[PDB]
């Protein structure tokens, strides 16, 4: 509904690069997107750490359902809202190991991982969206992407050097 990005045949990606000396490291994070697709299997938005670091965030599709998996340094834990081609908004937030997710006005789903665990998504490097290089490029519509006070797609519309577009993509207007 908002700033709409369309992934055409095969799809593509907008790639946003953090400056080497300004890469952040946050215990808690906020994620929010509005998609419109009917894919039964795909990966929507992946965000991995720098080289040599296994902390990473993935928000994907499995059997048409929207699941999110992630690791902060110890292991993987996944939560899913157990897509119809319309502008459905999904908000994903975390605080260290604590993880919560919700789609539109549906009841919130939250996880409380057990045991001592790391609590920082150490040294993020870049943001991947659409799964162009994950083997599951996304083909649909994405509006209102958001990340802990950084809506990259809006910066993508601003034509910034840190950001780079690649693959099959179309913009409204």
């Amino acid at each position: 509904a908002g700033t709409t990005y369309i992934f055409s045949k095969g799809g593509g990606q907008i790639t946003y690069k953090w400056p080497p000396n300004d890469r952040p490291s946050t215990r808690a994070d906020r994620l929010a997107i509005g998609f419109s697709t009917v894919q039964k299997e795909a990966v929507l938005v992946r965000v991995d750490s720098s080289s040599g670091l296994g902390d990473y965030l993935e928000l994907h599709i499995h059997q048409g359902k929207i699941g999110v998996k992630f690791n902060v340094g110890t292991d993987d834990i996944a939560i899913e809202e157990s897509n119809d081609g319309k502008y459905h908004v999904v908000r994903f937030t975390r605080s260290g190991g604590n993880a919560t997710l919700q789609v539109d006005s549906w009841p919130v789903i939250e996880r409380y991982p057990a045991g001592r665990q790391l609590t920082i998504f150490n040294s993020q490097a870049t943001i991947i969206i659409g799964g162009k290089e994950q083997g599951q490029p996304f083909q649909g519509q994405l509006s209102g992407l958001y990340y802990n006070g950084l809506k990259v797609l809006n910066m993508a519309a601003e034509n910034d050097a840190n950001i780079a577009i690649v693959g099959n993509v179309r913009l409204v207007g």
Partner: protein
């Protein structure tokens, strides 16, 4: 105004407009004894700090606030205290003369020339130190930056814990954290940028700053940090047996109640002055009272947190003086000859037992280390064996732990410039064969030489030294603004040895570091041979 006034969220304060004795730097608007927390006098004792109640009118904040409780005529740990601190002991006592339980106050040194913010942590030990000792004016007069000094709970009053909810201890850090929060919401009124807050400590304070870097509570209260001479993992950095030391403390006090909470109440009902005067003697190279693994401040041992990389990538400066355990070489410090063979082993044997106390593997370490720190070119000389003994200790407590800090941090893509100090000022008490010692850099950071010889550091300095003193602060302030000690202000005399020098980062693979001194140069691996022995080999000999 020569007697300016300023406003804060808690009211208004009156400061001074002192003029420094130099003729190159401008005026500084100082502030003395600014409150930042409720004085924990009554039941508040051994409770987390609370922000102070706002005052009406204008507060006369132009006098040095009272020092926090601490004893000088006692068995203080001389091993970890800065050398100058023990030398001119009575001079230090002069500064700590108004001990009062309402010690939570902080100062400022606003210069005239948004201003960058530099905050300081003091403390040679964890049971000693009053911020007033250091005159922050000069630095603020040279870097056009905000210098802040603060007091916090010390000794038993700050780090008393049973390990349970009745007593968590670690209060001092909380007080420092609170002040940072205070500086977060106040400094802008004085003209200092809240987004460029930097913390630099030394010795025991150096241990504090790292704890903050690992703190959960300190998530966004600064951006940069400095450290020096002991980072996080020294034998004395963190206590682990608080319960054992508390029990005897209360026993010597008298009310050694079986339950901690009952013990907590009795102490809360006992005068503060009595607590300080009471004597507690911890095992050598260990701290009776100090920060402990709790869960709310430090979730786990710093090594564990550091290994997995638990921190929000604050740029760091870490350094160590060449020879720092001067006080550790004490008995033979005043011998015309060196350390004898009969006395050399004994030193090592005692050292190994105290730290690596273990009956299973003792001699293997005892023999191996014995050989390692002995230049066989002059095996029987004796005199040079003293230096290595000094080199032995300093390597273990400061160099190696600091190196481990840098590598681990660098491994997680965090800007870190390692440094090292070799120059020193001729001190009457210090021996000729000594070198830049633990605490022979704080004056340079504060630029005391610019002012000249003072009560704390009567040893005068040469013009050459003065030139360097400017160099270091230029580097420090350079970092405070951008982070690259070169970026903002190119170096200058203001010949100059430090003109072409380019200070690189500290990559884990290539351990490039800066060798500050009379002849600054960029080396690649500080004492590579020894450091590896203390981080890779020595762990394996414990099965």
């Amino acid at each position: 105004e020569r007697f300016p006034v300023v406003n804060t969220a808690y009211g208004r304060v009156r400061g001074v407009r002192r003029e420094l004795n130099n003729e190159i730097l401008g005026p500084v608007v100082q502030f003395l004894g600014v409150p930042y927390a409720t004085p924990p006098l009554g039941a508040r004792r051994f409770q987390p700090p609370e922000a102070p109640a706002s005052w009406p009118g204008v507060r006369n904040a132009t006098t040095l606030p009272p020092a926090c409780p601490q004893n000088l005529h006692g068995a203080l740990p001389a091993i970890m205290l800065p050398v100058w601190f023990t030398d001119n002991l009575e001079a230090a006592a002069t500064y700590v003369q108004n001990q009062s339980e309402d010690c939570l106050y902080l100062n400022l040194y606003v210069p005239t020339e948004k201003k960058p913010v530099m905050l300081f942590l003091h403390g040679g030990s964890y049971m000693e130190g009053t911020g007033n000792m250091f005159d922050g004016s000069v630095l603020a007069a040279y870097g056009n930056v905000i210098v802040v000094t603060l007091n916090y709970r010390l000794g038993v009053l700050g780090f008393l814990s049973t390990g349970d909810q009745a007593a968590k201890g670690n209060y001092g850090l909380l007080d420092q954290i609170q002040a940072l929060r205070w500086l977060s919401e106040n400094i802008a009124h004085f003209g200092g940028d809240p987004e460029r807050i930097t913390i630099f400590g030394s010795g025991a304070g150096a241990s504090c700053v790292n704890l903050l870097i690992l703190s959960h509570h300190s998530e966004g209260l600064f951006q940069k940090a400095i450290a020096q001479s002991g980072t996080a993992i020294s034998s004395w950095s963190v206590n682990y047996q608080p319960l054992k030391y508390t029990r005897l403390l209360a026993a010597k006090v008298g009310c050694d109640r079986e339950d901690s909470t009952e013990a907590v109440e009795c102490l809360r009902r006992k005068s503060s002055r009595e607590l300080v005067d009471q004597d507690v003697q911890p095992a050598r190279y260990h701290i009776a009272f100090g920060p402990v693994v709790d869960g709310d401040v430090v979730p786990d041992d710093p090594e564990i947190l550091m290994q997995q990389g638990e921190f929000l990538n604050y740029d760091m400066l870490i350094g160590v003086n060449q020879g720092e355990g001067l006080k550790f070489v004490e008995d033979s410090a005043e011998s015309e000859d060196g350390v004898s063979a009969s006395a050399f082993d004994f030193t090592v044997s005692n050292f190994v037992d105290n730290l690596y106390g273990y009956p299973e593997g003792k001699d293997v370490l005892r023999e191996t280390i014995k050989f390692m720190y002995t230049d066989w070119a002059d095996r029987d000389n004796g005199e040079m064996r003293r230096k290595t003994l000094l080199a032995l200790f300093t390597d273990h407590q400061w160099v190696a732990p600091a190196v481990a800090t840098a590598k681990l941090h660098a491994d997680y893509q965090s800007p870190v410039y390692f440094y090292t100090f070799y120059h020193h000022c001729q001190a009457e008490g210090r021996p000729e064969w000594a070198d830049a010692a633990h605490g022979d850099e704080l004056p340079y950071v504060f630029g005391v030489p610019m002012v000249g010889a003072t009560d704390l550091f009567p040893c005068n300095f040469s013009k050459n030294d003065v030139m360097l003193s400017a160099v270091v602060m230029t580097y420090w302030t350079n970092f405070a603004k951008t982070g690259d000690p070169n970026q903002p202000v190119p170096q200058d005399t203001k010949p100059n040895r430090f003109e072409e020098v380019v200070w690189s980062k500290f990559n884990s693979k290539e351990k490039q570091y800066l060798h500050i001194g009379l002849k600054p140069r960029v080396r690649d691996n500080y004492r590579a041979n020894k450091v590896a022995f203390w981080l890779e080999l020595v762990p394996h000999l414990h099965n």
